[PDB]
Amino acid sequence: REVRTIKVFTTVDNINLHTQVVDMSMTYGQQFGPTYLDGADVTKIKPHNSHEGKTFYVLPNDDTLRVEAFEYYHTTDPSFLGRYMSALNHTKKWKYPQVNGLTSIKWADNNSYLATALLTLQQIELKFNPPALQDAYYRARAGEAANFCALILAYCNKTVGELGDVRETMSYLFQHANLDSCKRVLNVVCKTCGQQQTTLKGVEAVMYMGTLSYEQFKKGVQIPCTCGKQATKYLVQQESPFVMMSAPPAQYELKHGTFTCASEYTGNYQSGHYKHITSKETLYCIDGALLTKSSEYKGPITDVFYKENSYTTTIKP
């Protein structure tokens, strides 16, 4: 019969704010359904004076919100916002030191794979299609990386605390990147079967699993033919700002100025730790918040990133 009310804003995207007047006697839950304040689940909290004028996230439960959510995130996955908020609640508590002019993450909750991915993303040319991802990437480049990390988690369907794979993370993120112009032309040659050429576009044009060396891919790599015998696969043409070469972790020597950055993986599928090696004026090894320099580097490398623009082979088949 006596009611206290505050004004708050609800949103799915943090750009379109929708005015609400809420009753302080009931929970946010009772009023909006699942509600979050800066990542924290406030579904079962009651509105408080300090809340007046703040923005709360809600799940998209009307047509306007569904459209906004889709336009912002480019996903219709009903669990997405929940998982993002959940992740954000953890990532907002992590530390993001500047290390050698790059935003890193101090180790917490098995986040070594995310630190490595975050560092990599700052050194290759990539534009994301979902406004959420692109906005968050710009802020992460500027030093505020908590949202970006939470979004990477939500898009890769990974929970805070779980061991992650960098190659898999890059692959999922790449699905949301504009890589439509990227083109790869391959040739596979059999002394018996002949020469078979393949054109790839998009994510598949910038990724390779089986060798770390971009040079080796240009020169030719041995693979089975349908004939049963050994054929040569080699890169004919590449049009992309970068390429990613991956392989199961093995001892490998990184030579200064022959690549942009690399992932080191110590461990197996059940446990392990990533470190990031970048080529600048010398070799930097970024391990979360820790930085070491060296002229040479030899370690279990699993991904290497190289710069590219437009490459044509000099091989005449």
Ligand SMILES: Cn1ncc2c(Nc3ccccc3Cl)ncnc21
């Ligand atoms: C021997 N081994 N252990 C892991 C692994 C791998 N993927 C992976 C999975 C989880 C975390 C990190 C990575 Cl690199 N790919 C190839 N060989 C691998």
